[PDB]
Structures are given as structure tokens and as C-alpha cells.
Design a protein around this ligand. Structure first.
Ligand SMILES: *[C@@H]1O[C@H](CO)[C@@H](O)[C@H](O)[C@H]1NC(C)=O
Ligand SMILES: *[C@@H]1O[C@H](CO)[C@@H](O)[C@H](O)[C@H]1NC(C)=O
Ligand SMILES: *[C@@H]1O[C@H](CO)[C@@H](O)[C@H](O)[C@H]1NC(C)=O
Ligand SMILES: *[C@@H]1O[C@H](CO)[C@@H](O)[C@H](O)[C@H]1NC(C)=O
Lengths: 497, 497, 497, 497
């Protein structure tokens, strides 16, 4: 169906412009006939998940790069891919007119879009908020008698979450993370700054904070929304830092272990939302494997933890092997999951660059590394942001795949959107990553998986400027001859039988 | 009856701290025999509307500046003083515990406070809201069948206004201003930006818009609330700039004239709400006399306009004589009314500065200038904000007389609150401005008025660092020997017989 | 001609891209033949000062809008047009390769560019500096023994001014303004803040500050640069404001008058630079006429003041007539001159909008209004800035006609460049503004002038979206039949005898 | 000799205030008989390198943590400690009066100070410069006939270096690093941005770049200055990132390897500067082991490389063992050297925080880690900055141990300065690191070394708030009983014979 409408804003590539009557979209997905493959391609020069098809050949000779599928070499199963319905995202998406709202959400959740099946929902405010509430701001309300959802949940977040789940055919999983507790639970009595929960695990502060999770879940449930998982805390390590600028609650690894063991675990387990999964960490991967060891080598915490959630920000100084690889090595039965990423973020980095192809490649590059080191899902931060990278109450502006221009009733799908979509669209839940051996060294990032149904998907990213010819070999069926254009991303799909 | 608990946040003066169980207040007001006066004094060093009394003597001991009351020189009568019940004010007030809410409302509205008698009510969202909405967002509802009040009005604003009116002895007048129409009535299909109504005065867009005012007043009346006056649009000049960041609807002085003549006047006059006054402009005074020349020289428009509303905003605006005074010269029978002021702000300054004497002095200096140029009322912007100048979906750029810290169930009454009250408390509705002649050039700002019962009120602001020896003469009573200290504001009240 | 090479960044219009080998330029200037006129046209839709010619007709019929020249009604003679060589502008310029530096300079200063003949030069640092510094930072150095120029002058500004002057055919006039004195001369001991010169006019602080001007001139003279004029102070009113964020030195109008009379006037007179002119004010036109009355009615200050300089930032609260008009009325023989303007200065306002036509129109609209009220020249602020609108040590970033992209070795000429050039290129020094009566109300902005040689220039701006057919009538020659397209600026030139 | 004059600027500890006539200093250093130790102590509460002496006893009365010297366990020898004479440092130091310049230089370089013995020198401009420039900006001077030292070198940098060496009793080693080449050697023809050399190693560009290094070394040699070493490029990885803001010149580890092999090693070997050592990397340590494996396993490259230079960047950075420790294991005979450290972001803290104890601890913590992982030297960034962290032509983002306030002819010594001196003062060149075994898990950071003459030195950092009881055992002498106060740093020195 409708192709991308490009616009340039002076960066390395175009955005696709959507408005109330128009937005680029896909035909209903089909599988290629046996003997043939599907290819989706996006390029710096302006191609956007464009479909073509070719034959799978019985024969290959040559000495080009060859990537061989190893279907018998099974690794992790995939959970999925999505983004965060923060107060900022929900507010920008609802400031468009109704028809443009639907196109924005179809872009993400529809099979005519990119098939998101994760939404991370913050528990009360974060920096991507326009004020600093919590759900229990009445001081010393240890019974949480005055716990309630503000309009940010009931008017913004929740309605849009329902609207998304209605557009998706895949089941979608919700993931909640808190940034701060009520201030009267905290040693410093502020939403920000250095400060943790008062007292010691097992006590009334810790028991209240754990009941707060259940009240959150109870409230979302009145609104007919169920969670797949919760994290123990957003970036617990942030709250150990003096002058930390926005909402945070600090835990040392040991504090997190004992809060889970004493309070959060038992309290969740004793409640009707006992099937909600718990993920620890929810922080930079530099803190691994150590935080995993401290928590998971204690069997009283360990029985309550489904998985470890990682944020990407320090990936660059934390090699995947030493962090993710090792963690998996030690706790192979405890899933690794990526719960948050953005560009950028860093003091040198400018916030939103409309049309940036470099940012797109950062995303797919980090997705491919994640999948090659055991990680079962990948989750972007804000679903949508304004051209400033906000709102953000503390001016901590960042970039997002969809940029909303409220004065235009229009939105811009960035390269970050399409680079993500190269995975989210073609790797349903249950996909199992498999082996893929390169015949010689190369500058490509490639990853192979199998869908629950047996069929193959391979993603290939080219971040160097030169076209690279390659053959994908699958012994069940044959050879795929193709080229990786420079600054391209490709997904290949084929039936195996 | 209870004194100010001062607190310093490191600016030039203190705030007054209030909480669920304590707030500063006044005894019922009570005034002495002929020959005696009352002085209420607030200083930068900490005095807050403190009362003393003294003699009005027949012998003149002062050899300094003399201010002589000239009761026969008679000017405008006063409508009153108030502030705006924006979504932001309501949300801040409603996040205090109910005893703290009552103390807050009594501070403004009761005789034990500063005696407000004006509330401004936005019609649907503005920047001081946590979301975008109008009362009719279901597209092309040209008969306004789906017009309704959201929760902002039914849960937050309306109960708060009901409670203000119960606490008030004085009759309270409500004033209403739209920021935006439904976006389907708009050139640009956007709640913000450069964008006016579709079509031309008299057509179906323009009739629908005008009907929206009647549906508005209908709705509030169903809630037992009646308006004194509506404005023709908040800040119509802003709807003609750029991608104006907040909710707006642009009108040229011409387009307002025609909308008033063809649509809004006709529609209002046709309804039960025909007694509601219509105010034009609602914008910076730089736009006068020109806007008034445009609208009011049209008999078809002018028969429906009861006054001209002006914004102060306040870092900032035009000379008074050339704008306010010239407008009064040309149209002496159309009242002038200040419908919105705010401060700073002010790129090198906080939105909120707790204890800023200077932002207080700015309020009183401007109310005085206003009174001296035929303005009949002055109404503040947001009644309350948080310590960030929020919530504001776009950006905070302004202070408020009261700052709520909900995490501590506390509120702070800023020096601005007391500069407002030095007028609002002691200048009831119907009071008349009268002459007051200075005997020599001086630094003070002074205004004299007469109460409906003929008693005298004089306010004196000293914005300089120096104590000014002062004498006030009432021809009918005598000489009041006094001193205006540096950085103070005084209100003198005395019986004339 | 090399034509404009356009680029969009998503705003209303295009920039013209220039690099080390290419930059849009004009052919050498020519007179249109008697009986013919020349037209230069710039439009929103992409035309950049492009030349055509048409006939001057013997007669006219219509009914249409007729602008009639009144050659015998004569007003001010023009000094010229230009911009500021700040530390920021100089730094951005000299960060391009040498051949790109000369293209940028030829753009402004040569006949194949837009013929600038004013350069405003800061005396030390302002906000558009990357450090605060004065020429005399050794504390208490009343003799100015350690006065010297830093590299900001000797390596950046000076060499770039020598180059500009070499590229200009027209004589260029240098105008200097100080933001701060050494901090030891100031009551507050800081470069910024509220604070003025210590002591009293006539005294050592004041005499030293006046000798610093002569030492500035001495130093520039050593480097073969001569000044046309100095202002008494950049924005003297900013030093009267508490917490003023960057470099400033406060003067009341009375302190200004008295410093000129006692110190700066005599000190410049007794020096070899006695022919350098002195302009007072160098601040917002709101301060007029009062600042003018206070200074110029003192014959001892008056004998030293050649002119009054005005900045544009508060033009919009200060109708031109009340300020510029009244001041000229009171002091017809003391020239008015616009010495600084920029856009993006509010909050509200974004900083750099690459290719913004609105900002372009804001510049031309202000130049016409200035020329219609007696003003003899107009000076832009920074000559060039980076795409963030800096550098600026205090982050007070703004727009500029030329934006330098150091990383691409490229520069962008904005719509503001072309809008200024429709004036600077065509109105040499000595042009006298003359009458131009319109036949009916219109939405156009127009101004006529006569070159020294006796020929005619008319500039016409259309800020409405509507094409407006007009006839210009000169009685010496005939009718020019034309159209003013919407969002266009035109210059018309013709010989008269 | 003279004690610290403290001043608080509202951070966690004091600065020590120096001017033209006073600065804190040390007596010439002097050490007691066998059986007695010296302790220099600095505390957050205000103690600054305070000296006391005590006994080393036969009897062990301590029951807490024991640290036992292990002199026979012998590690790397130390090259030294210093910082960078950038343009920004030089500009700050010389805007002080001569007497204050000498007290600043004696602070760092004399034994009455902290005995620096390393100065790093930028080759032409970097971000800590007030203008862009190289030594060869005349385009296409491939024999570099137009190679010259600007005033930054000949006026600022060189005389200051000369005076540092006059003041030093220790011999000082100079380290040179380039940021960018002349831009006509650059793929991108820009001073910053994503750009490398043109062409390929061996060619005309690369031989020109290599010769540039010799030209530099010839020039400084004419000013009677010789280099210890040069680095192959400052932060080579920075110039592989799209539009990098500061001067860079990108090399992949491969291009560095070939540039060293083909061009730089060969040219230097063939010159009179063949003794100048060459350090590779000069970048973040996250780039190790990889960068070292690429360059050092190529024998044509390795013959030419004396060491690997690392940046500490410093509110990040990668784990020590896997970078520095693994690099030592793989290439045990190639020295590691810390060539640049600084603090800091993060985005919510000032560039400069005057008296920030935490920042001091960061210096000492990270020096100790260095030492514990085979690093032979540690060299600070800018020696001095202004109170803004400037001048920086791009953006201030880092602090400095000495902050200069020129307007008051004063300088401020940071905690960071003293945290550095606890090493640089007491660990002379040729000291060897030795074993020091902790008896139990503890919080302190501790390192032991031996002077060339056999005497012992141990430094103990307490980054926690609790006092830690401490015994230090020397097998040859006995037990030194002591306390490591909360937030202290200690240097102990003793004769072993
Ligand atoms: C929306 O986009 C389409 C595709 O470019 C265009 O034809 C249409 O005019 C747009 N509608 C609006 C309201 O801009
Ligand atoms: C409220 O204010 C009063 C007077 O300042 C004080 O005594 C009281 O403790 C406050 N209440 C609380 C909960 O702090
Ligand atoms: C300079 O611009 C011209 C005109 O567009 C173009 O042909 C050329 O590519 C540019 N040169 C460089 C170095 O980019
Ligand atoms: C320099 O410092 C010393 C030590 O505080 C002090 O007594 C002296 O006044 C200072 N000199 C100046 C110019 O303040």
C-alpha cells in the first residue's frame, strides 16, 4: 500500500511524513512460495522496507562472503520488541487529531505497520513527564488509602494502550517500571537526588513500597489491562548518586536482593497478580554480571526473579561478552531482556536529528548484538517525542523513532523506526535464534532466527559504505544470492519446507 | 489572628508557610472613629499586612512630601480583584489534604484572607493544563451535540469555584476565556500555531463557535454557576504567529469585529445568557488604541461589547497613557479591565522564586498604574502553581502568589499574594478612584479611592531603598503623619465623617 | 551571477548553500537605460534577488494601487547598512577553509554581494564571546598601563575587518560599543550583574573609563583601523537590572549625560580621535524620547553627541511614531541610527530556523519602518553564527543571516541575508529618503529614496499571501506597471533624467 | 611553610586561596630515622596535606584491617605525574600578575609544591583553544615550507614551559599530541567532523603528516625544548564519529598501525629526534585490548611503539582488568601510560565545582586503580581553567585542579590538586610498585611503592564516611598503627633501613 512520503531536514537521510489523511503502510504480510525468498530493504538513499522477491538456487560457486545457516544450533526464544508509553509520548500522540492518532498507532501495532508487541508503562512520573507526582503523595499513607491513578494514566496512557492492543493482532505484553516511590518512603524525602527507601527490608517502608506495586496492578486491572512483567525499579543505581536530577530510588545490589526476597516477591506472590513476572536490574549492563550474582546466588530472592532487564546507555564500555555473555553463562535459565534505549543522551550528542541514518544503525546494530548474546527482546524508550525531544520536566531531551509536530497535525517516522521494524515486524514471539556462520571476515552485522512455524528470517545491516555481495546458505533449501548495499538494512524471509 | 510563619528560600524576602493545620489570617476587619486611621504594612524584611492605628491631626508636622486627597475629583468604579482557576491551579490545590485546601481557599476568598471577588475560568485547555482538549473534539459536530465538560471542570474546577463562593462574603464574579476552538473549526487543524476560524463571519463555522459559548454557559449553569462576563478569545493576536506553542485561535482586530457583530453578539443576545457581558481584546495593551478603534467604531460590533480586557505580562509592556489612557479618551464609556497578569519571565530567572520581594513590587506597581489609567479590575493568572511553575504541558515561564508543595502537604504565600491583598482586601466592589495630589516630584506610587460608604483608602508603594517621610491630607479630617519605609507597601483606611 | 544553490531544512523557505568552491553572487552593478527600470525579486517560493527589467510607460489606467513618488519631499540622508564582527562571528568565519572565508566575506562586503558599509565592533567581550575579558583586567590600573588587545582582536576581528574593507568598493564605517568596563571600575566588582561605574562623573573611575575608549582607538589605529563612531555604552539600562546574566555596565540617563559631559566628551575631544562621533543610548527605543530629553537638553552633553543609536528588541511595544518620531521632532539635527537587531530572542522563539522566510520579513519590515521614521542606517547583530546560534558563553543563542557549518566547510545564507541586501545593496551612503504616497490602503511596506546621483530606489515588501498589482508613478518619467507577489520583497531602480 | 587559606563556594569541601602575595606551600621535604613514619593527610573537613610523624612498633595492637608491605613482589616502575599546557591553561596563567604566575607554577613544579614532572603539550589547537589553527594552514604546502609556531606556542606555551622547568628540581618530560592536521590533508577538508587522512599509508599526505611531527619537534628544539615522547594522535577514535565537534583526525586501529609502520615510525627514526618515544592509542581504555592487538602484533608497526597511552574519562569508564590488565598480559613489554584525565559531566553538574571533594576522590581513586593495573604514569588535562571551565571554543565540560579568577588576581587550588599531590609529590620517577596485601575485605583504596632508594610510600584513600582503623605492616620494621578517617586521603612514608 502507501509508500513513504520523504522529507529532508538537512541530515544524512529522509523522514517519512504522516498526517491525518496519509501514512506509509504495508500490504497484509504473505509468505514467499517455497523455492523463493522475500527481501525487505531500507537504505540511506531513501528506500523504506521495500518488498522484492528472488529464487533460492540449488547451486553456488564463488568465493564471495557466505553466511551459512546452522538450524540445529538453537539459542534463546524471542519475547518481542516495542516502546514506552511515557507521559510525554501519550501527550504528543493525543495532541494530533483522531485520524492521525490512528495512523501513528497503526505504524507501531498494526500488521500493516511494524508489529510491536511490547509496551513499557512507567509507574507514575519520570523525566518524560510534565510534573512529578506519584500515585500516593499523601504523607505517611502506609495503608495506601489515598492511592490513585491521576489523569496521565486514565486520560492519556491507558486509553492509548487500549487503542494499541486493539490494533495489534499479536498479543502485546505490558512491562511496568517505577522511577520513584512516594517521598515519605524515602530517606531524603524528595522525588530525585541521592536516597533510598527508609529502614531495612522486611519493615513497613519496604512492605508499603511492595504493596504499592499490587495497588498499581489492581488499578490497571480495573481498567482491564494486565501486565506481563514489572521491573524491580528503573535504574536502581541512579538513586545512589548525589544530585541525581529526576525521579529515582536507589538500591545497592544487596538492597535489591533483600527487598525482592523479603517484600516484593512474597507480596506479589500472595496477590492475585501472582502470574506477573519480575525482572531485576533494569539498568546499564556495565553492572553485570555482578548484580546478577548478588541477587541470583541467594535462593530466597532467586525464586522470585524471572529475568534481568538491561538498558543500553553504557553498552559501549561494557562489551557484550563480559556482561551479557557471562551472566547467561552463570544463570542460563534466567532470561536477559533489553528494556530501554535512546539516542542521545550523551553531553556531546544533539537531541533530535530529523532523518538521521546514523541513529537508525545504532538501533539495529544494538538489536543484532543483543540477539547474539542471549537477549530475548528489545524495548525502545519514548514511543513519540516533539521536535525538541520532549516534553521533559528536567530538559533531558532525547530522540525518538516518531516525531510529532502538533502545529502541523503531522508526524515523522525516522530511520530509527525502520531499523527497529526490520526486526519487530519479522520476528514474532517464540522465534528462536539460530546459528549463522560467516565464511570469511566482514563488516556486516547479521543474525538468523527461526519462526515458531519453522520458517527462516535473517537480518543484515551494512554500516560501511561499500556494497557487499553475499550468499546465504540454508542446507534445507539452497542458496540466496544477494548484495548488501552500503548503508542498508535487509531482512530475508523464506520457507524451509 | 494568626501571624506569618516566615521561611527563606534565599531570595530577597520570605514566603509565609501554611499546612493542613496552620495558615496566617486576619481578624474580621474593624475600623476606628473619625480622627483615627488604620495602616496595614508589608515590608521586604518580613512584615506581612500588619496593622497599626494612629491619629489624623489638625496640625501639619511634616516638611516633606504631601499627598492630598481630592474627593471631588472622581474617576472609575472598581469591579474587583481575582485570579485564574486553570487546570494547573485546581490540580495543585486538590493535591493538598482537605484542611490545607480550605486554608488555601480562605486565604484568597474569605474576609479572614484577602477577599477575592473575581475568578477567571478557561473554557477547556490552555498551556496550564496536563492535556489538550476542547469541549467538542468529535469532528464536524456542527450543532454541538457531543459538547460536554470533562473531568477538569466537573471534578477539579467547578467544586473548587463552589467552595470559593461559599467562603466569600462579597459576591464573586466569574469571567470565561477560550484559548482554542475544536480543531475541525480551524484553518490549520491544530490546537496551537498560526490558525484562525474556517470561512468568514456569519458562516457555519463561525455560528458553531459562537454556539459553543452558549453551550459552555448552559453547562456551567446546569452546575449552578453563572458568569459575569466572557472574553471574545484569550489573546487573539497570538493565533497569528508561526507555530504558536500553545492553544490559540487567531483574530485580526477586523475578524474579531465581524465575529462579534455577525456571530457572537447575535448568538449570545438570542439566549438566556444575554445578561453575560462580552469583553474584547483580552491581550497585551500594546494593541491599543488600534484594536478598540477597529472594533468599537462599528455600531454593529460595539453594541455588544461591554468592555476591553487587557493583559499585563509584565516584564515588559507599553506606556500606559498612550495605550490605556488614549483608549479611554476615545471610548470613555467602554470599561477597561486587566484580565490577566504574570511574572517574570525572564530567561536568566526561575519561573518560581520563593520570597521574591521584587515580583511582589512588580504586582502592586502595575495595579497602581492600572487604577491610575481608568482600569476597573485586575485579575491574576494561575491561583496556585507547584515549585516548578507547573503543571504546564508546554513550558513554565511564570510565578504564582501561592506555591504548593504537595509532598509536604504545604503551601507558600509569596510576597505577590500580599501585594495583591493590599488592594483586593481593602478595595471592595463599587469603590471609586479619586484624586490624590502629590505636592512635589517623588518616588512613591500612590492611589486613593473611596469606598461606597464614603470612607477613604490610600495605597502607597515604596520601591526604593530609602525611607520616605510622608504626610497625607484629608481636607475634611486633617493630616496623617507617616513614613513610607524603603521596600514597603502601606494601605491607609480612615472614616471621613 | 552564480545562482543560489538552495537547501531545505523544513522551515518556510530555503537557504543558499555555499562551500569553498561555489557561492551565489551577482554580476557587476548596472544602471537600467532611461525609460526602463530594474527589478530585484526575492520570494518565499525560492527566488533570490534576481534581476529583470521592464519599460517605464507614458500613461496609466486603473483604479489599481498607485504609489506616487514625491521627489521634492526630502527627509534623512542614509549612513548605511551592516552587521557585527563579534568574537563568535569572527571565530565561525575563520574556521572555514580560506576560499570559503572569502566567499562569505564577498557576500557581505563586495559589489558582487550585498555591499555592506557598516561594521559594528565590540570593545572586548559580550555574550557572543567564549570568555569574559576586558582590555584592562589588572585590578586598579588607573593609568591603563596593562591595557592591551587579546587575540580575539589581533588574530580574529582585526584581520577579518582588514579583509572586509579590502573587498568593499564603498567606504566602510567602523562603529564600536563596550558591554563592560574592567570589574575594578564597577561598584559590583563583576562583568555582569547590576552595577555601574564607581564614584561620580568627573572622578578617577569615570576619567579612567573615558581614557579606555581612547586607548581602544589608539590600539585599533596601530593596526591601521579607524573608527567612524563609538556608542557611550551597549544597552546602559541592562546594568541597572539585578542578576543581568552577561557583560553590562549600568547608566541612568542622568549618569549617561553626566559621563558624556564630564568625561567621555572632553576626553575624546582632547585626543587625536576627536573626529570619531559619539552616539548615545545604544539601547531599546522604548527608552525614547526620555533618554534623549535628559541628555540632549544639557548643552554640555549635547555639544558631544552626534547621534542616537537604537536596538530593535522592544520596537514592538514602542510605536515608531512615539519614540523615533517624537525624538526627531525634539532634536531634528541629532541623527537616529539602528545599531543592533536579531531574531529568536524570546522564549517562545526557537533560535536558528534555517531558511525561515518570517525572520527575513521581520528584518525588511523593520528596516522599512526605521527608514519611514528618520533613521539613517541599520546594523544587524552577529555577521555569522553556528547552527546552535553561538558560540555564546551564557547560552543566549539567536539567529544570524549566515550560518556556518564548520564540519561541512559550508555556510548557509538565510532569507534574512537577502532581506537586508534588498536594502544594503541598493541604497548607497548619502541616499536621501523621499516621499511616496499610496493611492488606497494596502498591506504593502514600501519606502522610496534617491541616490546621490539623482536616481530612484523603491523597496516593496509583501507579507500577505495575496499578489498585489501596483503602479509606481515618478513624475519625471512615467509609470512602472508591476505586481508584488505574496511573500516577496522587490527593489526597483530607475534613472530619472 | 604556609598553610591553606580556605574558602567555601558551597560545595562539600574548601578550595585554598592564592594570590600575588600568598599561596600555601611545603617546607623542603625531610624524613625521619628508621622506626618513624611520616603521614600527610587531607580531609574533606579541610586538612590539606598536613604532616605528622609517629612510631612503627614491634607490637601489633590493631585488631582491624591489616595492610602488609610485600617488597619482594615487584611491578611496574613509574614515569611520572603532570598535566597539560593547553592554550586555555596558558591564557589563564598569564592573565595573572607575575608574582601570582610564579606561585601557581611553584604549586605544581617545585618541591615546595607537588613536583610535577610531566607536561603534555597540544600540537596546535584543540577545543581548549580560542581559535582554530594548525602549524601549516596554507593549502597544499606538501614540503611544509610554511610550517610555523603561532603566538600560542611562542608567546604563551613555550615561556610557561621554560619557567616550569626552571622551577622543577626533578627532570620534566614533555609529551606532545596532535588533535588535527592542516585540513587540506583531510578526507573532509574540515578541522573537526568524521574525517581521516586522504589516500593511503605510504603516500604523499601520510608522509606530509609524518613530517609535520618532525617539523613540530624541530621548532620546539629551536626554543631549547626536547620531547620525551609524542602520541600518534589524540583520541583517534573520535574522528570516526559523524560531525565530531572538536578538532580530530580519525584512525581505525588498522590505519594507525599502517601509518606508524609506513609513515610515522620511519620518518622519526630517519630524523635527529629518533630518541623521542612514540605512544599509540591515546584514547579511552574501552578500546583495549583490541587496539593494541591490531597495532602490536604487526612487527613493522611494533618496532616503532614504546607504549600505549590511555584517557580516563572518568565519570564512565570500562573495567580495569579486562582493558589495562588484559593488555598487560598480551603485551607485557609495552608500557601503559595515562595521558589525560578529567571531570566532568554529568549533564546536571557544573563544569567547575569549587571545593568538590568528590571530584578529588575521583582523581585519587582512579590513579590508584591505574597503579594497581601496571600504568607507569598519570597526566592531568588542563593545568588551569577559568571559573567557567574555559576558555573552550566549543563547550566547557570539565573541571581543573587550579581555577583562575583574573579579575581578582587570584587562583584556587581544588581538592583535586591535593588528591593528585598525594601521589606526584611522593612518588618520584623510578619508584616501583610493590605488593601490599589486605588481610580482609575492606573499603579503602591502597597502593604501595618503593622509591629508587628503598624507602616506602603508601597512599590510602577513604571514600566512605566511616573512620577505618588500620595497621600497616612492614616485615622489615614493624607495625604502623593508624586510622583512615572518613573522606580522607593519606600518604605514609618511611625508611626501611
Ligand atoms: C497529507 O499527506 C498527503 C501525502 O503527501 C497529501 O497529498 C495531503 O495533502 C496531506 N494532507 C494534509 C492535511 O496536509
Ligand atoms: C504546620 O505548621 C505549624 C506552624 O508552623 C507547625 O507547628 C506544624 O508542625 C506544621 N505541621 C506539620 C505536619 O509539619
Ligand atoms: C560546492 O557546491 C557545488 C554547487 O552545488 C557542488 O557542485 C560541489 O559539490 C561543492 N563542493 C564541495 C567541496 O562540496
Ligand atoms: C592575598 O592573600 C593573603 C592571605 O589571605 C591576604 O592577607 C592578602 O590580603 C591578599 N591580597 C589581596 C590583594 O587581597
Amino acid at each position: 500500500a502507501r509508500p513513504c512520503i520523504p522529507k529532508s531536514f538537512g541530515y544524512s537521510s529522509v523522514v517519512c511524513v504522516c498526517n491525518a489523511t496519509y501514512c506509509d503502510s504495508f500490504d497484509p504480510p504473505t509468505f514467499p512460495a517455497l523455492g523463493t525468498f522475500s527481501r525487505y530493504e531500507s537504505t540511506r538513499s531513501g528506500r523504506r522496507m521495500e518488498l522484492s522477491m528472488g529464487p533460492i538456487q540449488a547451486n553456488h560457486t564463488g568465493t564471495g562472503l557466505l553466511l551459512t545457516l546452522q538450524p540445529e544450533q538453537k539459542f534463546q526464544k524471542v519475547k518481542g520488541f516495542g516502546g514506552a508509553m511515557t507521559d510525554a509520548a501519550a501527550l504528543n500522540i493525543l495532541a494530533l487529531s483522531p485520524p492521525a492518532q490512528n495512523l501513528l498507532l497503526k505504524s507501531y501495532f498494526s500488521e500493516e505497520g511494524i508489529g510491536y508487541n511490547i509496551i513499557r508503562v512507567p509507574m507514575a512520573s519520570c523525566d518524560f513527564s510534565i510534573r512529578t507526582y506519584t500515585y500516593a503523595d499523601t504523607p505517611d499513607d502506609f495503608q495506601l488509602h489515598n492511592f490513585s491513578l491521576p489523569e496521565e494514566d486514565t486520560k492519556l496512557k491507558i486509553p492509548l494502550i487500549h487503542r494499541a492492543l486493539q490494533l495489534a493482532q499479536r498479543p502485546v505484553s505490558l512491562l511496568a517500571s517505577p522511577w520513584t516511590s512516594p517521598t515519605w518512603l524515602k530517606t531524603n524525602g524528595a522525588v530525585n537526588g541521592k536516597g533510598s527507601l527508609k529502614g531495612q527490608p522486611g519493615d513497613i517502608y519496604h512492605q508499603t513500597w511492595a504493596r504499592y506495586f499490587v495497588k498499581f496492578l489492581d488499578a490497571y486491572a480495573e481498567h482491564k489491562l494486565q501486565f506481563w512483567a514489572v521491573t524491580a525499579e528503573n535504574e536502581p543505581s541512579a538513586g545512589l548518586l548525589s544530585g541525581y536530577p529526576f525521579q529515582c530510588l536507589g538500591f545497592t545490589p544487596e538492597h535489591q536482593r533483600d527487598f525482592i526476597a523479603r517484600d516484593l516477591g512474597p507480596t506479589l506472590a500472595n496477590s492475585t497478580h501472582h502470574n506477573v513476572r519480575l525482572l531485576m536490574l533494569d539498568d546499564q549492563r556495565l553492572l553485570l554480571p555482578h548484580w546478577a550474582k548478588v541477587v541470583l546466588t541467594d535462593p530466597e530472592a532467586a525464586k522470585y526473579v524471572h529475568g534481568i532487564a538491561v538498558h543500553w546507555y553504557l553498552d559501549f564500555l561494557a562489551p557484550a561478552k563480559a556482561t551479557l555473555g557471562e551472566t547467561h553463562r552463570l544463570f542460563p535459565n534466567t532470561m536477559l531482556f533489553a528494556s530501554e534505549a535512546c539516542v542521545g543522551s550523551k553531553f556531546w550528542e544533539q537531541s533530535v536529528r530529523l532523518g538521521s541514518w546514523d541513529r537508525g544503525m545504532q538501533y539495529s546494530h544494538s538489536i543484532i548484538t543483543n540477539l547474539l548474546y542471549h537477549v530475548v527482546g528489545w524495548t525502545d524508550w519514548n514511543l513519540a517525542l516533539n521536535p525538541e525531544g520532549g516534553p521533559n520536566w528536567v530538559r533531558n531531551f532525547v530522540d525518538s523513532p516518531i516525531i510529532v509536530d502538533i502545529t502541523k497535525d503531522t508526524f515523522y517516522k525516522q530511520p530509527m523506526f525502520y531499523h527497529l521494524g526490520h526486526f519487530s515486524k519479522f520476528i514474532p514471539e517464540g522465534s528462536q535464534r539460530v546459528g549463522l556462520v560467516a565464511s570469511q571476515k566482514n563488516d556486516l552485522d547479521a543474525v538468523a532466527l527461526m519462526h515458531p512455524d519453522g520458517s527462516a528470517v535473517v537480518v543484515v545491516l551494512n554500516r560501511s559504505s561499500k556494497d557487499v555481495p553475499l550468499t546465504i546458505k540454508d542446507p534445507a533449501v539452497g542458496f540466496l544470492e544477494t548484495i548488501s548495499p552500503g548503508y542498508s538494512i535487509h531482512t530475508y524471509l523464506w520457507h524451509r519446507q
